[model samples]
Target: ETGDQRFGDLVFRQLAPNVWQHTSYLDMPGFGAVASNGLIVRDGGRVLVVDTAWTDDQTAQILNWIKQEINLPVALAVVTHAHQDKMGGMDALHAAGIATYANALSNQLAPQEGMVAAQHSLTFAANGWVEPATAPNFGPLKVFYPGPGHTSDNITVGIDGTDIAFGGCLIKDSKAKSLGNLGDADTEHYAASARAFGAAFPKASMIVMSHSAPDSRAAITHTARMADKLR
Candidate 1:
């Protein structure tokens, strides 16, 4: 039911048929080594990576694992948000010449957060916006901007025709007691964004998160209600 592998500094766990969750740890100020999760989608000859490890070294470790173990060249990647856990190794991915994308708003916010921007920018409308991008090298993956939850530029990625969605920090894990990070959060629209995310990816049973374990579709509801009460 699961394929779990640990490389030098990362853990790759199979979440579904062709999907895996990659986790990397970055040391925080007072939190010691904090773990963050990313997504890997195997699409035959190529692989799709959502987000990156915390730093250039960690991200390089991930790329090496894919090359030596998965044996598939990474074709593209998505920087789900601007946080370091999301796009920290822009230099590494850029050095590898891998095509990576980040939202225009995320790109704008990344530098402000002391993180590097992605190689490409995914442009979309305002809140409740969902991108029509559904082809990941003849695959079925989508980028949805459910509006401001974790961050104003945060977005969600889901594999079309599948029940897995990478919510990053947009949707909290089932065990999450708090909304997580609120430093750059949009408190006014956080609940609304959570609802839009829940409604948009209603079928995503295995919702992958940023700093926590994946959970059921109910996590979305948990996130919305949590944010609702926080205000």
Candidate 2:
């Protein structure tokens, strides 16, 4: 059941066992399809969702797919970055009782900034994206925190057994001609954030970027390449 085809608004590419990458290349006015790419990591009786889609319509389609294909309950939803497109559907998933996980920064910023952001989006499905606070013990999963790169709350997803890393917005593709859209980013400490990821997970076998396709060990060397460019 694997062939080159697009689904709903996402392009699927099976990377590894229980690891499916979905990229949304659909063109929409105002919000230029930010690629909406992420990883779906399935475990024993639960699944780990990396980044959710931009609109509620998109999230509903993804949720339907996850339920039908995996069948396992969603244990947690990881908001890799704080961008509206990335975490906009958080409200929907949160209401479904999925434990939403983000780094300390996301855990903090989502409540503060998410309100303002929710206003800008054309769709209002997940109007209340800003929650009062995060739930306690939304863990057993180890997320990489590098201060700020793509956003103040950039959290990289790391699996428990496999050394695969979800680089989120921190790890950009080395060959990427330009950096990610930084409208709401802090430019000064971006390099430091990338460095933190490299220093922490020096032996990662693979990295799932927020925007790019899944990459092997060599392509996973984004941090090193980023440093080279900064200097």
Candidate 3:
């Protein structure tokens, strides 16, 4: 299969040999159906997922596809931030008996933001790295807390073998005209955050932003420039 599959509010297409980029739609008030991007990576008998689609129903579809199509158990699921688009599917994930994790700040912010917290919390060091060595279950993927950007708890995810980085909302798409959501953004630290993110996965072949199609590393620099110009 060349890997394009769509079923009931969810779509996933192959991005690499064992990785698929999943998209889920959310009807924003004035924006209509806005798509949120995430990842599904297969490693051995289990799979690792990054973030959720946009809601419980959409997230449930993700599980359905994995079970019926990919046919591998979901080993772990991590949310990039506390926003609904990222962590709103906690209920569905829990219902499927999948373990969930979120950055410590995200966990603390979720309930306040009217979303449920993940089952586990990950706190990155001052260095902002959650290396793969400590999370074998996450496969070769490592998590990086780039800094306060779209949200104080926003984090980026990357896979080693593929050199692919899921930029979440921290790194905007290369063609992004707006900085997307800035209500909770630390604009002053945004550029620095993007810089750290780009540096973390310097050779990333493709960087997937949460709301846009995956693109080359230019997305990172694009975000840095965009953030600095936001003044």
> What's the number of clashes in each of the models?
0, 0, 0
| Per-residue alpha-carbon lDDT of candidate 1 for residues 179-198, written as tens digits (9 for 90 to 100) | 87798899988999888887
Residue 171 alpha-carbon offset, candidate 3, angstroms: 1.2
Q: At residue 155, what lDDT does model 2 achieve?
A: 63
The predictions' CA RMSDs to the true structure, in order, are 2.1, 7.1, 1.8
Q: Which regions of candidate 3 are displaced past 4 Å?
A: 1-3, 131-136
- In terms of TM-score, how similar is model 3 to the real structure? 0.95
TM-scores of all predicted structures: 0.93, 0.77, 0.95
Model 3 poorest ten-residue lDDT run:
131-140
Q: Roughly what TM-score does model 1 have, to 2 decimal places? A: 0.93
Tens digit per residue, CA lDDT, model 3, 29-110: 9889988999999987899899987899999999999888889999899899999889888899999998988888899999
Candidate 2 lDDT over 1-231, as tens digits, reads 366345577566666676777665446688765676777777777787777777656766677777877788887777776666677777677666676665445545666766212211111112212232342333334555665666766666566566677777666675776566676666777777676665556676777787676676554455546544654
Best by lDDT: 3
In terms of lDDT, model 2 sits at 0.62
Q: Is candidate 2 or candidate 3 better by TM-score?
A: 3
Candidate lDDT values, in order: 0.83, 0.62, 0.88
